[PDB]
Structure formats: C-alpha cells, structure tokens
C-alpha cells in the first residue's frame, strides 16, 4: 500500500493530508493508526471513516473509489508521530508503508488544571493544592499561587518532567502545602501560569464544586 | 480495563527458535482474532500471523510460513508466537493485537528480538607450555569471540598434525563462539621446534597465525 507522502514537514497549526492507495479490495475498509517513537500503534480511524473512542475531533478518515486519506485538520505537537494505513481480510493484514509527520519546533502554551485538596488528606492536617502545567515549550514559565488573592511564598516546591523526544514538551507540577486551618479560613485559590506575554489563571472556592 | 502483556524476547542466534507470549486481561480471548505484528529497526509495520477463534484457524505472512506457529491456550488467556529457523531478517519488535472494529483496537507492548548478526574475527590467544609433565608437553591455542562459525585450524602450516585435536566451538553467553586447538609434543623439542597455530576465518577474511612460545 503505498502512502503518500512517505514523510512530510509541517508546523503547529497546519492541515495535513495523508492518502493510501490500496492494495487490497475497497470493501476490506481501511483502518488508520498512529505510532509515537518507540511506542505501540495507536487506533486512529476504523471502517474508513470512523472514529475510534477518545481520538481528538481534528483526525478524520475518508475514501475515494479505491484511494483513503487521512486528514489532521490543525496539527498539534503532540501529533509527531508516523501514521500507517491497513486493510484486513480474512487471510491476509497489510499496511502501508508509513508516513512521518516531523513537526517544526515552537512556543505550546501549557493546559492548566488546578486540584483543590482531598477530604481524606486534610484528615492528616495538610491541604496540598496541585498546579499542572501540560505539555509546553520551552521550559521557562512562572507559576504564582494566591489565596483570597494574597501572593504565597515559600510554601511551594515544582516539579518537572520532558517527553524525551525530538518535538517532546515539558509537563511540570506545583505543589502548595497549607495547614487544615489556613486552608479552611480561606476561600479562593488560584495558580497563575505567565509564559512570554500570556498569564492564564485557573482557580477553585472551597467547598464549591 | 483490556491489556495485552508480552513476554519472551531477547538476543537469539540465527538458526535458532524463541517463544513470545501474549497474556490478555479484561476479556477472554477464545472468541476473538488475535494477531502478531513486527517492526523492523527503522522500518515500517508487518504482519506476521494471526489465528482464529473456536477453530484455530491460522495464517501467516508469506516471509514467515513453515518457520512459526501461532497457538493460543484459552484456559491460560495466552497466545503465543514459537519462532524457528529464525534469520537476521527476523529481528524486529514483536507486537500482539487483539482483533476489534474492523481493525486492531488492543496491542501489547512489544518485545525485541534480535537475531546475531555481527561479523567478528578471531582473537588467538597462546594456551603456553611450561616443564612438569615427563617428557610429554601441551600447548595450544584458544581462539575466542568470533562469529559467525566456523573457523579451521592448522599446526606449522599443515606440517604438524600428530596429536593434534581442535575441540568442538562452545556459544558464549555474550553470542560468540569460541574454541581451543591443542598439541602434545616431545618437552625436549620445546627449546627448538617453534609451533604456530593457523587460524582461518573465512566469513571475517580473517587468517590468525599465532607462535606459541614457553613463558
Ligand atoms: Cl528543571
Ligand atoms: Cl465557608
């Protein structure tokens, strides 16, 4: 099956195309998988056009007489990877012979998630509050913590984990660690995460799903 | 939650056979296909075999036929892949994948096999004679870490060849074979006959001759 392009540059943000011309009969539906470095295939697309559960919206499958694309609408870094076509029949797998997708390097900005403490710590006398930052590059970014809008200071420790690849990104986590008491006399906590001229701030209120 | 756990990879000779193991969770797998790919370093995926469920039915790819057999053991969740006849073409990460929509929706996490390739010429070394054994004297050569087999052995050129014995080569743990040439001569020749062991190895274009000198 051959695949068209074998290898393909691209940047963030941009639509991509990859065909197979199949070498088997159309009505055995093509199937598409992704494959990180060193890493199991990954189901993409099945019966040409169907979404496997939890794939992202941007991949989508289709067909044309004897020719199926796959198409990554807006390409996200986390989307290096080469991609393979399939056709099954009852005695014979094949695949097409894959398509690199190298994506050029630039800033990602980090999706943001904050996790007030559990019930059961506070029952220890601790409320650790978790700030993740996920998937960006490059590595510098400023996480500042308030509580009831009051900058905290020394009373934080981060964390830092790289995918160690060659489009890899930085994951990191800060952690706040507060008394039951101070954690129970106030009432909005927020982590602010400033890279170059963006600050995003993701908060909670205690007691307030 | 559904998981495929491989087991039984490694560094194997070619000619040789391996066992790769394929454990399911979450789902029994008497009532579905299950699948063995590979990939090659660098290269792309490849089917290998598949069997089929109640039946046993099996097929393979044409690369691999008559050298492994799929099989799988319901009361164990397990399948398997037994590799034979394995050849450097063979070295690849094996993956199992369970049969789904269409396609292959579980897969373990791969195994490597790797099938020993490198060329290595000879190391000779002297197994040197004294003297402590009446008027009898050994000597030698250890010929260590080549591949692949085989090399030959000669004495002087082919002029010595009374108590002569080559051994059989022995597979090292590492993948390399050696082996050790040894001679029984008179200790009073010791002095002045010189010895020299000949060693070729063809598939290196390597030729070691070695003088084995008292120490
Ligand atoms: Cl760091
Ligand atoms: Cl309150």
């Known amino acids: 099956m051959t695949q068209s392009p074998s290898s393909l540059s691209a940047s963030v943000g941009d639509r991509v195309t990859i065909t197979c011309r199949a070498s088997?009969?159309?009505?055995?539906?093509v199937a598409w998988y992704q494959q990180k470095p060193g890493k199991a295939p990954k189901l993409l697309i099945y019966s040409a056009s169907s979404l496997y559960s939890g794939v992202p919206s941007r991949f989508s499958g289709s067909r044309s007489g004897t020719d199926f694309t796959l198409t990554i609408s807006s390409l996200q870094p986390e989307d290096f990877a080469t991609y393979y076509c399939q056709q099954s029949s009852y005695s014979l797998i094949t695949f097409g012979q894959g398509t690199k997708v190298e994506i050029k390097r630039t800033v990602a900005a980090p999706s943001v998630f904050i996790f007030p403490p559990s019930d059961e710590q506070l029952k220890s006398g601790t409320a650790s509050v978790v700030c993740l930052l996920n998937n960006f590059y490059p590595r510098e970014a400023k996480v500042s913590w308030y509580v009831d809008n009051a900058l905290q200071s020394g009373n934080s420790q981060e964390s830092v984990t790289e995918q160690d690849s060659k489009d890899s990104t930085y994951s990191l986590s800060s952690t706040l660690t507060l008394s039951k008491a101070d954690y129970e006399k106030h009432k909005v906590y927020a982590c602010e995460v400033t890279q170059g001229t963006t600050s995003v701030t993701k908060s909670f209120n205690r007691g307030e799903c | 939650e559904v998981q495929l756990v491989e087991s039984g990879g490694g560094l194997v000779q070619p000619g040789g056979s391996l066992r790769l193991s394929c454990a399911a969770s979450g789902f029994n797998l008497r009532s579905y296909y299950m699948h063995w790919v590979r990939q090659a370093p660098g290269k792309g995926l490849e089917w290998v075999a598949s069997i089929s469920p109640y039946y046993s039915y099996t097929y393979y790819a044409d690369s691999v036929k008559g050298r492994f057999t799929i099989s799988a053991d319901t009361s164990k969740n397990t399948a398997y892949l037994q590799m034979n006849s394995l050849r450097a073409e063979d070295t690849a990460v094996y993956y199992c994948a369970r049969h789904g929509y269409g396609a292959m929706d579980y897969w373990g996490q791969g195994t490597l096999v790797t099938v020993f390739n490198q060329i290595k010429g000879p190391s000779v070394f002297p197994l040197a004679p004294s003297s402590t054994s009446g008027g009898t004297a050994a000597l030698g050569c250890l010929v260590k870490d080549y591949w692949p087999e085989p090399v030959t052995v000669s004495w002087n050129s082919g002029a010595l060849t009374s108590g002569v014995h080559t051994f059989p080569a022995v597979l090292q743990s590492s993948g390399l074979y050696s082996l050790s040439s040894v001679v029984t001569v008179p200790s009073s020749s010791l002095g002045t006959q010189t010895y020299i062991c000949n060693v070729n190895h063809k598939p290196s274009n390597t030729k070691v001759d070695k003088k084995v000198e008292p120490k």
């Open positions: 088997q009969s159309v009505s055995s539906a």
